[PDB]
Amino acid sequence: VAVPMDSTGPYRTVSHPENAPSGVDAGVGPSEWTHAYANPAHNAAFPVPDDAPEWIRNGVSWLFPEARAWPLANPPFGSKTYGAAEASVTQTQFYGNALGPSVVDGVVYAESDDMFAYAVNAKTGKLIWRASPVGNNLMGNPLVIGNTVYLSAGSVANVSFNGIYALNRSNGKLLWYFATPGETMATPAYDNNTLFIADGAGNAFGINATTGKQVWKTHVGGMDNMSSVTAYRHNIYFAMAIKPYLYCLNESNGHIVWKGTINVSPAAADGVVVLDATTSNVIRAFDAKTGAVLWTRNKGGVPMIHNNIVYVGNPVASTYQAYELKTGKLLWTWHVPTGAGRSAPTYYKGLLYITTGQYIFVVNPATGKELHQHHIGGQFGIESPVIVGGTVYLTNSWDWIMAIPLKTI
Amino acid sequence: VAVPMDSTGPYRTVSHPENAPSGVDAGVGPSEWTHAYANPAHNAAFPVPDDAPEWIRNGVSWLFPEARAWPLANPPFGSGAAEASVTQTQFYGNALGPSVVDGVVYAESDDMFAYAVNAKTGKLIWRASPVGNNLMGNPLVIGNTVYLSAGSVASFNGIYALNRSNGKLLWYFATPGETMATPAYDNNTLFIADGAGNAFGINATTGKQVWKTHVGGMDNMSSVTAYRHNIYFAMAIKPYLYCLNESNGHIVWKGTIPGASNTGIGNVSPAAADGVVVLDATTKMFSNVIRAFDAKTGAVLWTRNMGSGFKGGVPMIHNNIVYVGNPVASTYQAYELKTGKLLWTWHVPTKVAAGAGRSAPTYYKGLLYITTGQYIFVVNPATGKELHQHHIGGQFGIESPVIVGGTVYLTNSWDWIMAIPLKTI
């Protein structure tokens, strides 16, 4: 397949197979990544067997510069022009990673607004491959299924090129692309050999995850900005702007199941689908199957559902709150010390992990009290911690991929 | 200077000093490039001395792929076809032509790299990407410094100044809005207008700003023209052509093109010669209107309607004749600089629906050279009759041929740098 490229140029695909994990190194972590935040619940927390290799259980520490990497100690580039907050958002949007990484079978995958996708070794941190099949930003986390990694191209604002690009997981070569007129900033969803994505022109597509050819097309209208498609129980759920509805569609034929009302990816667990939006911030849970509104209570946080508890942030209030999944009452509220509340929390072995600002926080899920805080630098806008074994894997808005031992925080 | 980068990453500065020309090869072509299309007249045509090297007088032929280079035979990536031509032009390939100075060809591309290539052989001297934004103009080469302007029509914007030899980053001046337009160099100073409505004088050595003037509106593709101590540039959304003082940046005069589309006036760079400043704009189903101003006072000299049937064409002034394209009508016209009299109109022979005719013609040794569509044309400046046509491929949006001796230098919207012998055309 042909894309605009100089095979000898700086945008060429670079492969270093010697650094790929091998043997028991290649079994570490999940064998697939099907969603933004790896699962419909938006909790990426992966335990390892008792006999797992020592490096992940004890934890590893490595720091990987991405193409436009900026020092974590430095303030936002472009300080005296845009302003501190505007430059933090701007560098996040056009330089660094918007979302977190994808850790599968001993390899950490990230795609950056610097227009490259990376596959890095989860143990050492050395590059397996790097690729730039498209000249546009990549605002999501790579989906790793079988031997194929799936990338989504799109920009914040007929602006460059948009769609899904699918490359070989091993060497990074380009398998196929499916171009769309509207934004694919949203992470697609994978289920049963099919990819599901919504554009900014109001169209949702099923796509064959192998051949790359289109399966079905359904026009819902509106714009999908940051809300990544969620595939749950044979149906796909996604939100649209300019006509603010949450849709449920049939994965096979693309028919519309139901619509519901009230930038954020909806979380689904235990037959419940949670979303929050702005007008303040209102969170609402739906019955996944029939679309009936389960509860409603009084921009926006990305929810996580674990053990029938929703943990979601309030960017206006700069807080994270824990809601009971079915009843929707808020158990506790934790105030961030003085853009907090963008990232989804990670609940692992009885603790909460939150990447916000330049820090990673650990919070007690029972009382909502901060236990520890660990300084890193850079910025975490929407990046969420990915915890596998005793090691935390992160991306940063200054274009970094890192590994930190879980003990260190 | 520190910008967001991985020093070993794919955006690092790559230097191949072995490919730099030396001896008499380092004198070939002009010793400075101060403007889009090299001069306020937008005619880049350089004759060579009789003792000039044999390769430049007879011409060389080579083709250089840029990072996103796409085969010239292939159709536009992402095929509507014409909109994909515009889209790839804007986000992948070169928007403007190259800058040939002292035996080296300089280009900046929307692939976010700047290149220094050997004018003789075609092998890369250096490549650099100090900023993660598009480069929509041609590099300004003055002394030992190359000047880049970064901005996107949709990041970080401004002038980035690189070492001419190895490509290292000397300094940058950041602007609030996009600077897609090529700046202008005059008297140790760079002059640029951004998409936030601001025009700046900037010290071309230290990089510190001299003056800042809030003009309002948006400068999209209209490159600053520095003529007789004054800078001239067009702004959209507030559709005026401005004349500013290079020293203090105060506004001398403002001017208007009647019926100009709100967004149609700010894409074209004004040409200046012999006390006259020429600009054209599209009407807000499409027409194109050209108007000439008195450089000093802004008084309206003459106005003409170029035709009907998108974008405006970039004018050239040579020997008191304006040659300008009309992409709406796919025509080029010749007007007398002072009187506005229409000498001839030439219709583009083949049908390229993209709006052929936006780029500025080049007049060299009694002939017109026009890169439009997939072809470069040779046209009689007297009769406006097509003489020759030469197929290349790709697309030429805003790029104009840079001719040095017997060699034509080109960039293409498929992200290519090429050299063709003038004899071949």
List keywords for this structure.
409 residues; homodimer; 3 helices; 5% helix
Taking strands numbered 1, 2, ... along the chain, how are they ordered across the largest sheet of chain A? 1-7-6-5-4
Structural class based on helices, strands and sheet pairing of chain A? mainly beta
As a percent range, the share of helical residues of chain A equals under 10%
The quaternary organization reads as homodimer
Report the sheet with the most strands of chain A, covering strand number, pairing sense and barrel closure: 5 strands, antiparallel
- Radius of gyration of CA atoms of chain A, rounded to a whole number: 20 Å
PDB class: hydrolase
Keywords: Tetrathionate, hydrolase
Assembly: dimeric
Entry title: Tetrathionate hydrolase from Acidithiobacillus ferrooxidans mutant - D325N
Secondary-structure topology with pairs:
The structure is a homodimer.
Chain A: E1 14-15, E2 45-46, H1 54-58, E3 62-65, H2 79-82, H3 84-94, E4 102-104, E5 107-111, E6 117-121, E7 127-131, E8 143-145, E9 148-153, E10 162-168, E11 174-180, E12 189-191, E13 194-198, E14 203-208, E15 214-219, E16 230-232, E17 235-239, E18 246-250, E19 256-260, E20 267-269, E21 272-278, E22 281-287, E23 293-297, E24 304-306, E25 309-314, E26 319-324, E27 330-335, E28 346-348, E29 351-363, E30 370-380, E31 386-388, E32 391-396, E33 400-405
Parallel strand pairs in A: 2-31
Antiparallel strand pairs in A: 1-7, 3-33, 4-5, 5-6, 6-7, 8-9, 9-10, 10-11, 12-13, 13-14, 14-15, 16-17, 17-18, 18-19, 20-21, 21-22, 22-23, 24-25, 25-26, 26-27, 28-29, 29-30, 31-32, 32-33
